[PDB]
Amino acid sequence: KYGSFSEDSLYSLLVAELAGQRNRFDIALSNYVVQAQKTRDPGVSERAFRIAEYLGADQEALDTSLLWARSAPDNLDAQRAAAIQLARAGRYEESMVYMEKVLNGQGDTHFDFLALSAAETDPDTRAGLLQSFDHLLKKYPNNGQLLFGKALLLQQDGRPDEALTLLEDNSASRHEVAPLLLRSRLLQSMKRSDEALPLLKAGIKEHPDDKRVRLAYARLLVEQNRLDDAKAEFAGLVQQFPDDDDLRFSLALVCLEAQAWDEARIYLEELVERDSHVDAAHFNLGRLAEEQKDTARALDEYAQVGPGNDFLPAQLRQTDVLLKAGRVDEAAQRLDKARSEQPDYAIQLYLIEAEALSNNDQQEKAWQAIQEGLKQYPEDLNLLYTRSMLAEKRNDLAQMEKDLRFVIAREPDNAMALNALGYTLADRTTRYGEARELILKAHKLNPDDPAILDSMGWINYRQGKLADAERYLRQALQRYPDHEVAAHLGEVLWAQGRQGDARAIWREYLDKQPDSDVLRRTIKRLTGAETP
Amino acid sequence: SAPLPLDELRTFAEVLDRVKAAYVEPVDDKTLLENAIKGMLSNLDPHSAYLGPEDFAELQESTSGEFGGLGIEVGSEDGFIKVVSPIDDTPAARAGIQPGDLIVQIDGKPTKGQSMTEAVDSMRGKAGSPITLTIVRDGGRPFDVELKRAIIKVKSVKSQVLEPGYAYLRITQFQVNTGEEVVKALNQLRKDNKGRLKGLVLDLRNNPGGVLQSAVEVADAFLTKGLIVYTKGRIANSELRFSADPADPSDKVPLVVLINGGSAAAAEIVAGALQDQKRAILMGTDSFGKGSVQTVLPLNNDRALKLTTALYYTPNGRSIQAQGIVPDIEVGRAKVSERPQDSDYQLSQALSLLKGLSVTRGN
Amino acid sequence: SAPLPLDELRTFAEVLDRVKAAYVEPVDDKTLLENAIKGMLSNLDPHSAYLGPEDFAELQESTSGEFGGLGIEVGSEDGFIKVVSPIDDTPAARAGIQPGDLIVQIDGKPTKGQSMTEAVDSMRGKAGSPITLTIVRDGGRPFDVELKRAIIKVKSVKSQVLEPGYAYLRITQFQVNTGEEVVKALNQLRKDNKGRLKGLVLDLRNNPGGVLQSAVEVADAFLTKGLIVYTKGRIANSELRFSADPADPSDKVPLVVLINGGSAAAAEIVAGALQDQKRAILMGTDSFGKGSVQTVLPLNNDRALKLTTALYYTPNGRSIQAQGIVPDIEVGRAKVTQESERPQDSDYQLSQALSLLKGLSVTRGN
Amino acid sequence: SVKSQVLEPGYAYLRITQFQVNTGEEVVKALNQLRKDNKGRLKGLVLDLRNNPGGVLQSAVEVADAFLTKGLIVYTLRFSADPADPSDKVPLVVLINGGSAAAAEIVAGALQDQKRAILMGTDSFGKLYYTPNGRSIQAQGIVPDIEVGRAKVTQERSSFEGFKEADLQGHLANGNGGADRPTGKRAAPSERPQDSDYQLSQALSLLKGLSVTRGN
């Protein structure tokens, strides 16, 4: 029942196909568009449309979509694509025609696909499509599917209020699954969970079949800190769909949030034996073991799994829980084994080892670990940055400067390295001009990051200027409040003269981080007391 | 108004690129496409082949008549070069070769890979030159066979007066001018028997084939009415039909034709016509069944193809190529001055049949 | 960039149109393009070829010893399929089948009038599928046997101990698990000879090959150090070198390896490894002399294709392709005339191999 | 008395039918000329001291010296092994059908007991003398450490042989670039002695065995 090629139809196509693998896509476009224009067959037109959309050129893509819709119009997806392309081209009435083509078919009549396609479109094309949709709704206001599509487009625009009003107006939206899903999404985007949860449970009871409604209800409960209700609902879901690994994984997460460690680890072991989502299960198991009695079992679930991208956070949790348990040597041995398993993962394993050992205050063990990781692979900039941080914790300031300089040489674009080097030079150099140049490069690379602003303020203080340092440190603090930035601001105020505000801000940030020691050292050295 | 199978073409392009990527040798697209076309032709109809440009030039004129060959003919089947018929009066025929045997190795190389064209090209060689073949017969084990290659004379048809009442006319190969030799042989036989014979036996067995024109001529020489053979094919020019001529030096003598199963094409055409018009009767075994016609097809370039344009048809609805012509009586060959009749069992059976039917006819 | 060769494509299109127009039987473009792919793959080299679905499944079964069947080795006999030997640990073995049993019906349908291939296919099928066999045992009353088609692994290695201190070992066809098996075999043989084994004879005669990885594994199972074989080809991933892991259960046993004209790529690899490394001896005729590692590249149609991805080289750096290894002893099959079940007396080359092994053992002194 | 032959490359052949006077000098000459034949070094020799009844003791002792360097050759009369010998330690295997006796017997006994050679034939005739080892020879005779009963071997010609990779059309040329070996006509040019009697073939195979392995 297949068709039959012609002499030249099989010629051009072949070239196009061959060109499609020599990156000479233009020839493919020419051949496919010509053969779709003349042959009219569905498959050729569809291939032409896909190629045209891939390359980007749209006018010929618009023509190809029109032809494909004309070829086998029963394929409603082609009709939808042609309508979207027409909306992009601004027909605005033939787009409506193709809408009534795809719409009104009464077979899986779907506008979620249209919303997903429009998600990537530009706001102007989206606005044109929404105007066409409004005209259609005025023509076709009876069904709630039209309202659902219009509300989807409105949400894509960024104005959910009118969409939510439209959803509330019609009861069929409540009776239909998709419109109530949409109203839940709008309420979530409206920052009103108190209204989302009740309507969510109303949807659950009205349509218990749909698991998404209740899953989102539990998610909103978690966001609302109603952890017990979310845990119970997720247990009910696992009862409804025990085959679902993700549902039981979320149940384990919510149970962890509900400090019910026993059931949390039980669900994590259910995931492990189901051999799905096991790496996140292992991360959760390590967290639980940190918050639960035993840890050897957690090491066991960590070990029984193979390499995994999401296992790397799990491996970090394993290292941290081992450090908490006190057997640092076992963590080092496991990390060495993992490094032997894969060198690409070995670099990250060395990084995590150094960072975790630094966190537990073991600066020298972290330093030797990062030195190892650099001796297997000194090219990595992350390893050098970690060694620089460890040196700063160890006052090996020359090593920190060397590592930061090498990282900057590798990746000058990275603003964090420039900021670190500038701060180090400013703190450990009599002339701050080069430090100021480095900090300015970091600023022009990243002028908004709180650390960049903090370093700019510190270098300004060392330079001697006062107002710029004040403003930049205030910017850093409002971006993110930190005790070190507070100490820098206090130094700036010491330069300014208004010591009262320095004392007040120091008190505030010591309340923020009483355990901070750099802030207390600054207060002691300037105001003469540990606290002001 | 039907789906165009673009998927197959896309698959072919992907395969081409993947092959150009993965092969060990740096191989240009030219060789890839050439091999593609070669196999496209070969795997479809075994006889068909891609007559290349220099191959076409060679086919335009014979390179030299010096080289002869082993005389035998082959037809591709299951990828093995099998011997359809060892032409009579040839070392291969004289040597221990039986039609229906398979050639495995020729000149020290296997044949399961190439096509019958290459095997035939290898077979021919310098005159008076030895050669070796490894032939597996009827499932037996391979055994070396040494043969001498030399230019061969066929002599076409021989007529022997097997008995005073009967003449045994033998056709070796359907060369050109075979019909006139048959006609003059029949005239000589009439002269010997004073212008009346009691029947004829045409032992057109162990005969590969030849030019269709000679076959039509002889079938006319024995016949007067009806279509001798018609051809069918897709191309418009395919349809080629022949007929019968009132002239017949046969004198309406009864005929019995033998088909040992080592006969192909032209011989099959003649036998099928002679039974379809009920002019005669058959007594050998089932034929080899090859009636495909090959015609050279020029292309856009100087090159040309050799696709099987049309397959033959006997005057009835029967098709030679599909099933091969069958005899109304089956008599397995065997052995039982001396006359050739006493030697070959089928000939004795045929002569006895003519003797028995002579009285039935009366005069 | 490189020009898209257009003259050749135009010629191909013209030829396809002509063939569709002129061929006697109607032909669909799918068939023509499949034939074209088969043709190019086949004609590039003697070995590479497009693999269909049945062919691909057959190759997968051949390389991987696992297959679905009754675990019965059979032979043709006067129109009745004769059970040459019921493989151990098989549905037939637990069904009581014995050597000499004559299969006459497959679920009732007679074996008469059915070819060996037809009988093999009929007795084979999906795993877990019940099947009944009526089998005539030495001309006795036929009796039905109830079986279920079950997954089975065909043993690719055969063992024997011809003489105390001298053993025999065969690898009929390399397979994915072949390596593992031979390892166990060695241990078994050692356990057979309570630890001390003087000589060993490896049989590679008439081994058409197998997967390269298992060949390298078998090579390493005896050789200790060095590199067994490295491959070289145009593609980047073709360049790949294996190495002999120090572990080996061979116990440095003096080894003599046979090679016949029927020994192929994997067998030639093992032979070249054990020769260019002075660890064994090669006696026999020449080998098939094929060097080519081929890859079964998957296709979206489930009908993959096999292509010659690279050549290989013996440790010395010699490319054995098109030349064939040359055994040291150079012994051709012959018959000995003199003026229990021991294959040495039945076979010649095995006899001289065992003689060489015992001579070496004696020359080792005491 | 003597006869030399290069049975196969790196494996010459010697035979002492009788141990006549001056045989030592003649075997020295044969050793030198075959050393020239095979370019200064042989992988092994097959001294065919079988069907040898006896000879003059001076002949036998000089012959043994021709291959041995150290020790006492034969004693009842204490004949020494002169270090001078052109053999150069070519792996030697001596063949004893059983007819070997007296001069041949003592030469074989010396080349065996000194561990300078190996005995591969059958039990000797058994014909006082003492090998370099304390063991006597006349009383019991010498038992070869490996025995190969006299036998005749015939090789059959298969109608066809496996079509080598060189035969297939379009076979890839070897990486080394050496010419591929085709399967042309396969007929034996001659019946070299190694194929005639089982013992010679066994001896050559064993000699090749000691050459491939044991060299490391």
Residue numbers in the entry:
A (entry chain C): 44 to 575
B (entry chain B): 38 to 373, 410 to 436
C (entry chain A): 38 to 376, 410 to 436
D (entry chain E): 193 to 268, 277 to 327, 348 to 436
Sentences reproduced from the published study:
During bacterial cell growth, hydrolases cleave peptide cross-links between strands of the peptidoglycan sacculus to allow new strand insertion. CtpA assembles as an inactive hexamer composed of a trimer-of-dimers, but its lipoprotein binding partner LbcA activates CtpA by an unknown mechanism.
Therefore, we performed a heterogeneous refinement leading to two CtpA–LbcA EM maps. As expected, the two CtpA hexamers in the two 3D maps are superimposable but the two LbcA supercoils are wide apart, with one supercoil in a higher position remote to the front CtpA and the other in a lower position proximal to the front CtpA. We next performed focused refinement in the top one-third region of the two maps and derived two local EM maps at around 4 Å resolution. We found that in these two local structures, the LbcA adaptor domain (H1–H6) binds to CtpA in essentially the same binding mode, and the difference between the two structures is limited to the LbcA TPR domain, which is 44 Å and 18 Å, respectively, above the front CtpA. TPRs often serve as a scaffold to mediate protein–protein interaction. Therefore, we suggest that the observed TPR domain movement might be linked to substrate protein binding and delivery to the CtpA proteolytic site. However, both conformations were in complex with active CtpA, implying that the two positions of the superhelical TPR domain have no effect on the allosteric activation mechanism.
